[PDB]
Design a protein around this ligand. Structure first.
Ligand SMILES: [Cl-]
Ligand SMILES: [Cl-]
Ligand SMILES: [Cl-]
Ligand SMILES: [Cl-]
Ligand SMILES: [Cl-]
Ligand SMILES: [Cl-]
Ligand SMILES: [Cl-]
Ligand SMILES: [Mg+2]
Ligand SMILES: [Mg+2]
Ligand SMILES: [Mg+2]
Ligand SMILES: [Mg+2]
Ligand SMILES: [Mg+2]
Ligand SMILES: [Mg+2]
Ligand SMILES: [Mg+2]
Ligand SMILES: [Mg+2]
Ligand SMILES: [Mg+2]
Ligand SMILES: [Mg+2]
Ligand SMILES: [Mg+2]
Ligand SMILES: [Mg+2]
Ligand code: NA
Ligand code: NA
Ligand code: NA
Ligand code: NA
Ligand code: NA
Ligand code: NA
Ligand code: NA
Ligand code: NA
Ligand code: NA
Ligand code: NA
Ligand code: NA
Ligand code: NA
Ligand code: NA
Ligand code: NA
Lengths: 49, 142, 150, 142
RNA sequence: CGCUCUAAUUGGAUGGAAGCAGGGGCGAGAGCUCCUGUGGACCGAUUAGUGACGAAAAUCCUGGCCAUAGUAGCAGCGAUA
RNA sequence: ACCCUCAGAAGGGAGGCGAAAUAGAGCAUGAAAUCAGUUGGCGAUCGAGCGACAGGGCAUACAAGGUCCCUUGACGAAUGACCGAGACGCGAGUCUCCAGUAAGACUCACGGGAAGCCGAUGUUCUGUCGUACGUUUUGAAAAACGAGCCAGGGAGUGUGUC
């Protein structure tokens, strides 16, 4: 859940801004966002044997 | 009273007629800069080479004046490829034992930058005695 | 902050500096530019005339909308920035004072080097219409001065 | 006021374009040229159509401007400029080393360039540069 | 070709490592390497692995910054001080 | 610390400590965007994808590159003469011989020379070519879409089965 603990929403078109989820005027959740989730991170489920 | 480099600084390698010809060719012909397209138009775009991928790229399309695109036809002659401008083949050296097996007639040695002054002193005197030139010599007040 | 950007021979030179001055950096570039090469005493008399409004400081770079001045020679736009001028007088009072304490003739020494540097901004915020606020900052200026014997 | 011309061309009864073409070529070769008796230079054709073309050039223009000369002085000078890359360094230098004159301010009589002379006994359809200028409204100062 | 960390084999460093700046050499090229200054403690190579491994772009994200500009506003309100 | 300066527990100057204060307090290192001063080149008569490739000016401490210029001579691919002689053509001009000769890129040798001199680097001038980049598109310089600039971040991963 790293980076997913937020209700951030995108405003959509209208304010001259990219459609990026924001919370309190700060981008969040998405991989390109600072503090956003890791797109394809290491996983515990992986068989390393 | 003056600065002089240690070692056989003036030493030149002995090359076959054909190798010297090819070495002279490489020096005469040269090659284009091969810097990345439009690196000069944007500070965030560095000089490091990247194949132009744009479908409309002028350089990719081979338009005259937009710079040469990397191709195998630009390769240097096999016989001289990689040679120091002097004609010597370089041998990377880290210690005194690395000098062993080095042909001072055909190869010159380059002491890795990380090697300290104490070890360089030993390497330099031992190289000169073996008839091997040190490309990056220490300059002492002679 | 800055450090002296020019070498200075202690035996024939006097130094001085202003730190984090809250004044126009643009007025500062203009003033430095104009007093360089002058005698310490000359600069003082010049700046006092500026403060009085009898002598304009040429605004060669930051001149948008600036009205022309007849006393400006070889240029047109000029103004009378008293605040930055007063700070420069403090810089000269210090320099000339340091110079005197060292044995030199402070006033007669030439301004070998004078330069302003923007060291930062005291940040501020101005409430605007539509529930929005925008920047309302104050420049912070450092300035070096090196007096040299002539 | 004095012009050290290496060549002095006499334009009297000569075809302006053919002279200009040669004067352009020579000026580009480094020669300082002086065209003399411009008012007496000539252009072949039906006077009425010739005049219309030049009158049109006078009328043409706007705020940016299209300054077209009326005197035989300038007409010829401009005709030469059109045969030179006057906006390039070499072109401008050549053009500036060329000067046209009303009458002949020199002591020497100009030389007649080959293939530029017009035989009046064999031709009736042509006009004098001076005649063109008079029609254009120029002050006959020659 | 380059990046991280692991392993084996093997090297460099306070007689100055990494990094940074300017500069020299090599390679078609990815990129390798040297010199000088700064820096003041770590750093490689080969082989076999490893992978939150390579950016100019997404009205991309965050931070910093220039022009805009010494410009707009600091006048307008029946309370002109 | 002390002293001088100052409205002054400010700041500045001088000075002291330490290997180092450009380790002096959000103080290891200290990139880019960018700013001040300054150096080199250009510059108030001149034209705009900013360059690539050629070639000139001016500029350059060392190091890490050491080449480069002119006489002559040797070798000499394709190509390839002038002149002269003879013969044709109304004419521009052509044929035969001289001759595949002289010439002919690179490379080398002798002799002489350069050390800002050769390379290289900065800037600028000349020539040739040249309306960014990425994307959308049959067709993009596009009056189609995106970005002010820079740094850092930013997109084929795991399990199971086949
Ligand atoms: Cl290959
Ligand atoms: Cl400012
Ligand atoms: Cl007009
Ligand atoms: Cl032109
Ligand atoms: Cl006729
Ligand atoms: Cl060859
Ligand atoms: Cl993939
Ligand atoms: Mg996170
Ligand atoms: Mg760039
Ligand atoms: Mg105004
Ligand atoms: Mg409100
Ligand atoms: Mg091994
Ligand atoms: Mg891309
Ligand atoms: Mg931003
Ligand atoms: Mg405005
Ligand atoms: Mg009242
Ligand atoms: Mg620090
Ligand atoms: Mg369409
Ligand atoms: Mg990155
Ligand atoms: Na939360
Ligand atoms: Na697992
Ligand atoms: Na200006
Ligand atoms: Na005046
Ligand atoms: Na004036
Ligand atoms: Na005609
Ligand atoms: Na006109
Ligand atoms: Na935006
Ligand atoms: Na140059
Ligand atoms: Na698109
Ligand atoms: Na495009
Ligand atoms: Na269009
Ligand atoms: Na902005
Ligand atoms: Na990735």
């Amino acid at each position: 859940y790293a980076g997913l603990r937020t209700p951030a929403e995108s405003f959509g078109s209208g304010r001259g801004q990219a459609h990026v989820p924001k919370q309190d005027g700060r981008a969040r959740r998405v991989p390109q966002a600072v503090k956003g989730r890791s797109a394809h991170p290491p996983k515990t489920e992986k068989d390393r044997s | 009273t003056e600065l002089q480099a240690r070692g056989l600084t003036e030493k030149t390698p002995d090359l076959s007629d054909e190798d010297a010809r090819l070495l002279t060719q490489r020096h005469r012909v040269g090659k284009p800069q091969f810097n990345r397209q439009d690196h000069h138009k944007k500070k965030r775009v560095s000089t490091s080479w990247r194949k132009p991928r744009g479908q409309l790229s002028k350089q990719r399309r081979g338009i005259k004046g937009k710079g040469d695109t990397v191709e195998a036809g630009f390769r240097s002659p096999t016989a001289v490829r990689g040679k120091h401008p002097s004609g010597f083949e370089e041998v990377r050296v880290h210690n005194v034992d690395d000098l062993e097996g080095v042909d001072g007639d055909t190869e010159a040695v380059r002491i890795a930058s990380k090697v300290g002054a104490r070890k360089r002193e030993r390497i330099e005197e031992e190289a000169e005695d073996a008839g091997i030139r040190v490309l990056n010599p220490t300059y002492v007040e002679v | 902050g800055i450090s002296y950007s020019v070498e200075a021979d202690p035996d024939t030179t006097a130094k001085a500096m202003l730190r984090e001055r809250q004044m126009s950096f643009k007025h500062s570039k203009a003033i430095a530019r104009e007093i360089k090469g002058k005698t310490a005493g000359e600069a003082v008399d010049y700046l006092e005339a500026v403060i009085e409004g009898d002598q304009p400081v040429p605004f060669k770079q930051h001149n948008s909308g600036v009205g022309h001045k007849s006393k400006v020679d070889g240029w047109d736009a000029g103004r009378y920035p008293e605040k930055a001028s007063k700070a420069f007088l403090d810089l000269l009072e210090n320099a000339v004072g340091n110079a005197d304490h060292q044995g030199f003739d402070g006033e007669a020494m030439t301004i070998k080097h004078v330069a302003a540097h923007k060291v930062g901004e005291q940040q501020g915020r101005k409430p605007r219409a539509m529930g929005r606020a925008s920047a309302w900052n104050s420049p912070q200026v450092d300035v070096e001065l090196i007096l040299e014997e002539p | 006021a004095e012009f050290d011309a290496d060549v002095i061309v006499d334009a009297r009864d000569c075809i302006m374009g053919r002279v200009a073409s040669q004067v352009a070529e020579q000026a580009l070769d480094g020669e300082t040229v002086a065209v003399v008796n411009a008012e007496r230079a000539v252009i072949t054709g039906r006077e009425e159509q010739i005049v219309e073309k030049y009158e049109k050039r006078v009328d043409i223009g706007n705020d940016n401007g299209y300054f077209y000369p009326k005197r035989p002085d300038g007409i010829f000078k401009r005709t030469i400029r059109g045969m030179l890359p006057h906006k390039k360094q070499r072109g401008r230098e050549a053009f500036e080393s060329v000067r046209v004159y009303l009458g002949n301010p020199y002591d020497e009589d100009g030389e007649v360039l080959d293939g530029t002379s017009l035989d009046r006994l064999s031709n009736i359809k042509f006009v004098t540069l001076g005649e063109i200028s008079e029609t254009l409204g120029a002050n006959k100062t020659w």
